[PDB]
Design an enzyme around this catalytic site. Structure first.
Site, PDB file in Angstrom:
ATOM      1  N   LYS A 148      -4.381 -10.485 -17.619  1.00  0.00           N
ATOM      2  CA  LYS A 148      -4.621 -10.125 -19.004  1.00  0.00           C
ATOM      3  C   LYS A 148      -3.371  -9.508 -19.640  1.00  0.00           C
ATOM      4  CE  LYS A 148      -6.853  -6.457 -21.606  1.00  0.00           C
ATOM      5  NZ  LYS A 148      -8.038  -5.610 -21.599  1.00  0.00           N
TER       6      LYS A 148
ATOM      7  N   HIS B 297     -12.042  -4.575 -18.399  1.00  0.00           N
ATOM      8  CA  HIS B 297     -13.456  -4.289 -18.277  1.00  0.00           C
ATOM      9  C   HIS B 297     -13.932  -4.342 -16.831  1.00  0.00           C
ATOM     10  CE1 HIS B 297     -17.722  -4.241 -19.596  1.00  0.00           C
ATOM     11  NE2 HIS B 297     -17.884  -4.888 -18.455  1.00  0.00           N
TER      12      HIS B 297
ATOM     13  N   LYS C 187       0.826  -1.197   0.000  1.00  0.00           N
ATOM     14  CA  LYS C 187       0.000   0.000   0.000  1.00  0.00           C
ATOM     15  C   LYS C 187       0.869   1.258   0.000  1.00  0.00           C
ATOM     16  CE  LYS C 187      -3.830   0.091   0.243  1.00  0.00           C
ATOM     17  NZ  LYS C 187      -4.794   0.063  -0.908  1.00  0.00           N
TER      18      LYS C 187
HETATM   19  N1  LIG Z   1     -19.953   5.983 -13.382  1.00  0.00           N
HETATM   20  C1  LIG Z   1     -20.853   5.201 -14.045  1.00  0.00           C
HETATM   21  N2  LIG Z   1     -20.393   4.225 -14.811  1.00  0.00           N
HETATM   22  C2  LIG Z   1     -21.222   3.418 -15.482  1.00  0.00           C
HETATM   23  C3  LIG Z   1     -22.638   3.603 -15.379  1.00  0.00           C
HETATM   24  N3  LIG Z   1     -23.221   2.674 -16.143  1.00  0.00           N
HETATM   25  C4  LIG Z   1     -22.313   1.951 -16.698  1.00  0.00           C
HETATM   26  N4  LIG Z   1     -21.060   2.364 -16.331  1.00  0.00           N
HETATM   27  C5  LIG Z   1     -19.849   1.722 -16.866  1.00  0.00           C
HETATM   28  O1  LIG Z   1     -19.626   0.291 -16.850  1.00  0.00           O
HETATM   29  C6  LIG Z   1     -19.053   0.548 -18.120  1.00  0.00           C
HETATM   30  C7  LIG Z   1     -19.133  -0.325 -19.382  1.00  0.00           C
HETATM   31  O2  LIG Z   1     -20.305  -1.035 -19.071  1.00  0.00           O
HETATM   32  P1  LIG Z   1     -21.034  -2.081 -20.066  1.00  0.00           P
HETATM   33  O3  LIG Z   1     -21.582  -1.022 -20.936  1.00  0.00           O
HETATM   34  O4  LIG Z   1     -19.596  -2.588 -20.596  1.00  0.00           O
HETATM   35  O5  LIG Z   1     -21.383  -2.063 -18.556  1.00  0.00           O
HETATM   36  P2  LIG Z   1     -22.274  -3.116 -17.888  1.00  0.00           P
HETATM   37  O6  LIG Z   1     -21.596  -4.421 -17.909  1.00  0.00           O
HETATM   38  O7  LIG Z   1     -23.784  -3.225 -18.480  1.00  0.00           O
HETATM   39  O8  LIG Z   1     -22.212  -2.436 -16.402  1.00  0.00           O
HETATM   40  P3  LIG Z   1     -23.067  -3.148 -15.329  1.00  0.00           P
HETATM   41  O9  LIG Z   1     -24.616  -3.037 -15.763  1.00  0.00           O
HETATM   42  O10 LIG Z   1     -22.857  -2.349 -13.977  1.00  0.00           O
HETATM   43  O11 LIG Z   1     -22.680  -4.544 -15.159  1.00  0.00           O
HETATM   44  C8  LIG Z   1     -17.751   1.354 -17.729  1.00  0.00           C
HETATM   45  O12 LIG Z   1     -17.078   2.013 -18.814  1.00  0.00           O
HETATM   46  C9  LIG Z   1     -18.398   2.289 -16.634  1.00  0.00           C
HETATM   47  O13 LIG Z   1     -18.148   3.671 -16.950  1.00  0.00           O
HETATM   48  C10 LIG Z   1     -23.134   4.654 -14.561  1.00  0.00           C
HETATM   49  O14 LIG Z   1     -24.347   4.853 -14.457  1.00  0.00           O
HETATM   50  N5  LIG Z   1     -22.216   5.440 -13.901  1.00  0.00           N
END
Ligand SMILES: Nc1nc2c(ncn2[C@@H]2O[C@H](COP(=O)(O)OP(=O)(O)OP(=O)(O)O)[C@@H](O)[C@H]2O)c(=O)[nH]1
Ligand SMILES: NC(=O)C1=CN([C@@H]2O[C@H](COP(=O)(O)OP(=O)(O)OC[C@H]3O[C@@H](n4cnc5c(N)ncnc54)[C@H](OP(=O)(O)O)[C@@H]3O)[C@@H](O)[C@H]2O)C=CC1
Ligand SMILES: NC(=O)C1=CN([C@@H]2O[C@H](COP(=O)(O)OP(=O)(O)OC[C@H]3O[C@@H](n4cnc5c(N)ncnc54)[C@H](OP(=O)(O)O)[C@@H]3O)[C@@H](O)[C@H]2O)C=CC1
Ligand SMILES: NC(=O)C1=CN([C@@H]2O[C@H](COP(=O)(O)OP(=O)(O)OC[C@H]3O[C@@H](n4cnc5c(N)ncnc54)[C@H](OP(=O)(O)O)[C@@H]3O)[C@@H](O)[C@H]2O)C=CC1
Ligand SMILES: Nc1nc2c(ncn2[C@@H]2O[C@H](COP(=O)(O)OP(=O)(O)OP(=O)(O)O)[C@@H](O)[C@H]2O)c(=O)[nH]1
Ligand SMILES: Nc1nc2c(ncn2[C@@H]2O[C@H](COP(=O)(O)OP(=O)(O)OP(=O)(O)O)[C@@H](O)[C@H]2O)c(=O)[nH]1
Ligand SMILES: Nc1nc2c(ncn2[C@@H]2O[C@H](COP(=O)(O)OP(=O)(O)OP(=O)(O)O)[C@@H](O)[C@H]2O)c(=O)[nH]1
Ligand SMILES: O=C1Nc2ccc(I)cc2/C1=C\c1cc(Br)c(O)c(Br)c1
Ligand SMILES: O=C1Nc2ccc(I)cc2/C1=C\c1cc(Br)c(O)c(Br)c1
Ligand SMILES: O=C1Nc2ccc(I)cc2/C1=C\c1cc(Br)c(O)c(Br)c1
Ligand SMILES: O=C1Nc2ccc(I)cc2/C1=C\c1cc(Br)c(O)c(Br)c1
Ligand SMILES: N[C@@H](CCC(=O)O)C(=O)O
Ligand SMILES: N[C@@H](CCC(=O)O)C(=O)O
Ligand SMILES: N[C@@H](CCC(=O)O)C(=O)O
Lengths: 501, 501, 501, 125
Positions: B387, B209, B126
């Protein structure tokens, strides 16, 4: 630890620095290479001083060792690197229950300033392993030093060009040997300069002549320089020379024993010697040699036949010169008014607090500062390091050539005179004096170490004297010393685009 | 916060460790590989536990940076490496005026135990830089992170195989980017794995991701595992599931925002959100998305139209679940008796003191410990590191092959059935379900990150549950967790340079 | 040669060591740093001697080379590193069908003892490639040396700080050139000291003045030291000096040719010269220069006009001095009683077996041992290695400064005398003698090589003489020599990297 | 590799010194490294020695190598070893035999029936 007036060793040193920094601040703005001269220069100077004061790196270690009984024991160690304005960091290793981060950093910073005072091109560093050597077998101490070496080596805290250790409290040739071997046997197995990774090595393992006695010898020179000034000695109301001087040394180890050996050689007599268990005393003096034999024989000085177990602090004994050669803060506000001695020869690092310092000045006591007086160690450690890098013992390639040359040179004046004065003058033998006969082949390793250290101690003594004049510092040689060190370090920081617009 | 429940963060954690160590000490002597079984075994176990507790290395730095105004400023930073029983040390970097040696070491030790709980092969580490990010320009923060990187790299505190940093308080993708670039542009310019030197990198710079939302997602899973147990939920007198649950989160950053996003997705509703300037509140709930937009828009949550500026500590708000996702020691002896909530989801590291912990148990409050609950970050950081070492994005080489195989497999049961039931049965189409259609080509980077984290959080949840049973720890999940971590770390020392005298 | 006496070269040397070890064993226990003095000290000494005797490392290689015809040929080579008590191992490379593991190890061990005798800080090493140079084109020999270099470099058997080769049988400037180039072009392409990886290099490739003739020159000095003792020469019943001495040399290569050139320069005359095909002879002597031209012209000495093809062993020829400068074991139990000569100058390594040695002593023959007499090679190789590390040719930076200084020094005595003797004495020119005029600017590379070797051979000659006295060894200079080498190597192990105290 | 000693005549403390020192000497001459040469157990050596070997290499020459622990195999599972490595040889012996003992073609030339069920064996070691 004192009780009352026992400052945080690091802040204490930081104070000495500040004391000197305020005195030279004007000259630093004076010859400052800023184009935009307008007291912002004064600020740029302050900006640089704030960089120099703190340690750049401090490594804290906690590692396990297996005791000879079989149990595991976690041991703590530290290595502080104060400055890298000069590439190889330099500094010894202390083995004692008193080591801590603050102590190692104070000591590390004393290293850079002392190296600066004495013109050794090294940044300061310092290590400490928190154990009491006496409570460990030799087999265990080896495991400890070797493992400590590996941990430092893997984090960049030992290497011929990064950081070079050396002895200090409760360490010597032996530990330095284990350290070199461990480094060379592993990380530096391909390095042509692997053995320059540490100094204070045994002469057989690449060490240099007189390194063990180098500090005491430097103490002798540091004192010698001021004890023959008349100007200073008159303010103290003493006569120059050692011949009619008494001294007492607190510490009978590498520094104290040898400081004692040397002063005694020049007529001064040791009236008292101290150690952790006690002190001995004799108005008619004590012989360093029979005291060493008694110490080697009985593991202590107490009970030495030709002296009496002094009762009541070695530091307050009656003498002309007091040489504190043990640990830090031995002279504080509470015992300063009772030191008796006129000259305090700081063999140890940080033996007097800033408070005793004030008292000492007021009582007209001359305190030859540690960053100058004990620099004999690094000065010769530097010669050792240099010897390792050169892979030849001094003079080996030139003894015969110089010898022949000197005889042909002498023969040149001989033949010139005989041909000029013909058979009317006969043969005019131009022969070496007894003294020159000893030097006919040129300097040996020993010659350079001896003449080089003397040269260094005298040259630095002058600069300290010249600075104390220019700033009217009287017997405040410590402030004069820091002024000199700061001037030098500041120099590496200023010059061209290194730090300015 | 607090006044008299400010234990040393390090000793505090050392206490948790001890609490668990006494509970498993018997089993450690049980399956101990000593031949000479005679309670000296019990001592050898203790000897090993004393090795694990302290940090092996702590590097303290003091370096200068040039402000945008022109002045030099010395800034302090630290990097502690707690354990190396697993080669690459792992741990984030915190930028805040609260960092100190003790905080960095406590956090470093939390890293090894959390990695152990969640089966990530990393020793804990840390770092912390003692500055307040808000008081610095972006240009200055870059100089700071990049210079910090170089200083760590030269002392062996960053490298794909020695120590891999990541984000923490007031750091993110951006800093991780500067860190990687600095390392790769210099010391690691020849290293094929140079970019695995740090995690939490932007996806375009080799990041993975969902790494940013990984912690909040892990928080969701950690909670999900216990909130559906019935056994635990009955002791708390609650119904399983999120659907009828309210929660409040202290912290609206990387952990809090996403923890909030995820719980809200599964029916739970956020009644309150807090920050350093204050908190907002709404019994009918708050939408994580419109709150994020308001935050991004006004740099704060206070004044959010659809909620009221709550008055009186987010931690004492009325809710089922309290998620402290800010800094350490937010829950102390003085406010514990007023928490209202039944489940404390430790998103932050060290949010509750051992005293609040005692109070929490007595009031029948379930505290899902941080070393398990927030492990989602390192778990996915580990996937990122993996990765980088593999140099391929997941599934790239197999998407088509798997797709074709699955269709031929399905075609195999289709043809077998049709030939078995002849023209009497007609064509018997074996087609993928909608769900399987999404998985027909096999896992992508996103698939592995999501399924891998869920697998990890659930597997670790079981082990914590199984251990709390075996030792009758009730709602003392924290002690169960440390028991698990200790068992694992102990298991590496047990057969390190191995035993049998 | 001999059947009744052709000992195993390695055991043979191991015998010489033992012979000397028993003689000094008492003194090694004498000045032994053990605390627990009780003949276990005697055992600790024996424990150290058993470490020194065997080679630490032996690398055996089998590698393929492509002949100029196109076929592949497997060739064998070896490199033994006897000791590393002094970091850079040192030793030449022999190309001959006689090389084998035992020969390379015996030779390797001779290197450490010879370096010790002559104070060169190198551990001994030795390589041999089992081929017959004559049966290979120059293109093929290059492939061979270059490939051999790479294989050694990859296993740590060549490097400026690990192991530095040099010439030996059937190798010279040319091979050393290929070796340096291969190392520098690959593994050492970044090493500032890459060219110090091998010695005996051509002067244009970083070689040093007089390295080729250094061995013969050292042979001249080694002989010169004893041939002017009177004490020794009387026991042999001869007059001091070379002026009225005859000698015959077995070997007309790098060592023999030059040994011959030098003795001839000081009045001695070569009555016989031998080679593998035969020997030539002339009671009135042979001129080394016209013999070299005939050799260079006809590739042989046989048939030289001014001498007759001697018939019947060069070793039994009638002369005062016999210089075996070819391969090992040329003097055995069977031909010793017929050597005729009074002084055996061992230019080659291991030319006489322990049996001839016994016979030689009984017949009052003085055998100047190889570990001293042929040390001229490594001594100057060491100077070369040193030159590469310093990156400057000797005196380059000081010729002018010294020249001016010497004239001002002379001017100082001139002006002092003229002012003291006024116009009554006129001008008193103090001018350099012709000799001093040659040295007015100080030493050049050539000066150091010549004066340094002379200094070394004379200094080692004294130590061998002083030891033969102290132990009453008469004409057994070989035993005296090993005693000296052992004393030195054991010193290093005495304090040593370990500590036993 | 082979070290010419009789393990039985040495304490465990001494065997460790021996394997660790042997490791360093090989490491300095390029005879052990994840990409140059990877040792393993054999006669009178096992998990324990492999452990000392890995630790020595990783603690020194390979302290920066991300693959430092791949410098030797047969390591304890806790130190990066793999499942069933100790029994892997005997298991391979079983498989090697199994392959030929079910051929019929070979077993007929030997005049035996395939399978282990009615077979006796004796092992030296
Ligand atoms: N800060 C923020 N990030 C988000 C939001 N919704 C999605 N993300 C994003 O999760 C992104 C890509 O999400 P997918 O479009 O690949 O995301 P997802 O798998 O449907 O995300 P989850 O529904 O939380 O599992 C990242 O680039 C984050 O920025 C949000 O409402 N706020
Ligand atoms: N190369 C070097 O070692 C250099 C050392 N120095 C300075 O000299 C001091 C180092 O001495 P080394 O470390 O050389 O000494 P060594 O450990 O040999 O010193 C041993 C002496 O220190 C004495 N000692 C320790 N504490 C006390 C105390 N409270 N009162 C009286 N005596 C005490 C010991 O008494 P006991 O045996 O009972 O503990 C013993 O006589 C350092 O402070 C350092 O600043 C400076 C430059 C070079
Ligand atoms: N990958 C990760 O980042 C991981 C983080 N964690 C834990 O979560 C915490 C980190 O949060 P990150 O560092 O993720 O958060 P980020 O800095 O985004 O968090 C920002 C939020 O923290 C709030 N905050 C800080 N201090 C307080 C306080 N005293 N009271 C109320 N709110 C406060 C800030 O309000 P404001 O801006 O006004 O100061 C801001 O809204 C760490 O302590 C760590 O132990 C655990 C695992 C992984
Ligand atoms: N710097 C150095 O080179 C040093 C060398 N030495 C010693 O000198 C010897 C090396 O000589 P280099 O290797 O210098 O000599 P080089 O190969 O030039 O010597 C060549 C001569 O040796 C003659 N010769 C070889 N073997 C025999 C033999 N069995 N009988 C008769 N004559 C023989 C050769 O005759 P032909 O050509 O027909 O074979 C040739 O004329 C080594 O043994 C070594 O110990 C020692 C110290 C330093
Ligand atoms: N401890 C101790 N060391 C001594 C004593 N005498 C000499 N030495 C040590 O070794 C020198 C041995 O020195 P020599 O080569 O004869 O010394 P030198 O150059 O004339 O010595 P100077 O006497 O140094 O002080 C010093 O470096 C001391 O460390 C002694 O009586 N006690
Ligand atoms: N073999 C051989 N080498 C020679 C001869 N003449 C000159 N050299 C070479 O180069 C020297 C050239 O030497 P100079 O500068 O004239 O030698 P000196 O005059 O310094 O040479 P030395 O008398 O051998 O010390 C030697 O080192 C030889 O290698 C020769 O006649 N035979
Ligand atoms: N020497 C020995 N080793 C065993 C024995 N049984 C299992 N092993 C071990 O194989 C272990 C783990 O085995 P398991 O996963 O339980 O073995 P299996 O259950 O996979 O083992 P097999 O039936 O042999 O294939 C290692 O830790 C070995 O010590 C045994 O009876 N003797
Ligand atoms: O390289 C080394 N040579 C040694 C000789 C004796 C002893 I005791 C140790 C060493 C050594 C390396 C070494 C290296 C590490 Br890592 C360590 O913890 C220890 Br203990 C020793
Ligand atoms: O390696 C580096 N690439 C960079 C790109 C932009 C900037 I601003 C800095 C770097 C950098 C190395 C770097 C290294 C150090 Br040392 C330092 O104090 C700073 Br400022 C930067
Ligand atoms: O590094 C090298 N520089 C060379 C120049 C010319 C020639 I011919 C060879 C080299 C060389 C390396 C080298 C290396 C190996 Br393997 C080898 O078998 C050979 Br033939 C040569
Ligand atoms: O790197 C090392 N870790 C160790 C732990 C315990 C012991 I005993 C030795 C080591 C060790 C290195 C080591 C290295 C060398 Br060379 C050596 O001769 C020995 Br003995 C040990
Ligand atoms: N440890 C001593 C000397 C440091 C050194 O020689 O490097 C102080 O001063
Ligand atoms: N700084 C966070 C994450 C560390 C990481 O992902 O490496 C803690 O926990
Ligand atoms: N073969 C010679 C070579 C000398 C050297 O290694 O420089 C020996 O003796």
């Amino acid at each position: 630890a004192d009780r009352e007036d026992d400052p945080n060793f690091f802040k204490m040193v930081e104070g000495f620095f500040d004391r000197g920094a305020s005195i030279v601040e004007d000259k630093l703005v004076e010859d400052l290479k800023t184009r935009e001269t307008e007291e912002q220069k004064r600020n740029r100077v302050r900006g640089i001083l704030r960089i120099i004061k703190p340690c750049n790196h401090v490594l804290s270690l906690s590692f396990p060792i297996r005791r000879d009984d079989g149990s595991w024991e976690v041991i703590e160690g530290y290595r502080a690197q104060h400055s890298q304005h000069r590439t190889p960091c330099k500094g010894g290793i202390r083995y004692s229950t008193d080591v801590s981060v603050d102590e190692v950093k104070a000591l590390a910073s004393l290293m850079t300033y002392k190296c600066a005072v004495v013109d050794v091109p090294f940044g300061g560093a310092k290590a400490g392993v928190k154990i009491n050597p006496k409570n460990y077998t030799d087999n265990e101490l080896e495991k400890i030093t070797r493992r400590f070496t590996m941990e430092l080596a893997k984090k960049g805290f030992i290497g011929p060009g990064v950081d070079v250790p050396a002895p200090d409290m409760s360490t010597g040739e032996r530990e330095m040997s284990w350290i070199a071997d461990t480094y060379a046997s592993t990380i530096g197995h391909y390095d042509i300069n692997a053995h320059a990774c540490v100094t204070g090595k045994p002469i057989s393992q690449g060490g240099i002549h007189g390194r063990i006695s180098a500090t005491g010898r430097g103490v002798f020179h540091g004192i010698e320089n001021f004890i023959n000034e008349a100007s200073y000695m008159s303010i103290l109301g003493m006569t120059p020379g050692f011949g009619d001087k008494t001294f007492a040394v607190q510490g009978f180890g590498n520094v104290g024993l040898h400081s004692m050996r040397y002063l005694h050689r020049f007529g001064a007599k040791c009236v008292a010697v101290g150690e952790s268990d006690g002190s001995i005393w004799n108005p008619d003096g004590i012989d360093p040699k029979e005291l060493e034999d008694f110490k080697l024989q009985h593991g202590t000085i107490l009970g030495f036949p030709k002296a009496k177990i002094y009762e009541g602090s070695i530091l307050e004994v009656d003498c002309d010169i007091l040489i504190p050669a043990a640990s830090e803060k031995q002279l504080t506000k509470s015992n300063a008014p009772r030191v008796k001695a006129k000259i305090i020869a700081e063999g140890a690092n940080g033996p007097t607090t800033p408070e005793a310092d004030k008292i000492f000045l007021e009582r007209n006591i001359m305190v030859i500062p540690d960053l100058y007086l004990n620099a004999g160690g690094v000065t010769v450690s530097y010669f050792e390091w240099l010897k390792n890098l050169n892979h030849v013992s001094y003079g080996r390639l030139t003894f015969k050539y110089e010898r022949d040359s000197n005889y042909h040179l002498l023969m040149s004046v001989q033949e010139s005179l005989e041909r000029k004065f013909g058979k009317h003058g006969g043969t005019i033998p131009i022969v070496p004096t007894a003294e020159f006969q000893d030097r006919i082949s040129g300097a040996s390793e020993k010659d350079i170490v001896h003449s080089g250290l003397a040269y260094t101690m005298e040259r630095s003594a002058r600069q300290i004297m010249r600075t104390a004049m220019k700033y009217n510092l009287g017997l405040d040689l410590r402030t004069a010393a820091y002024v000199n060190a700061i001037e030098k370090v500041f120099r590496v920081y200023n010059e061209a685009g290194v730090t300015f617009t």
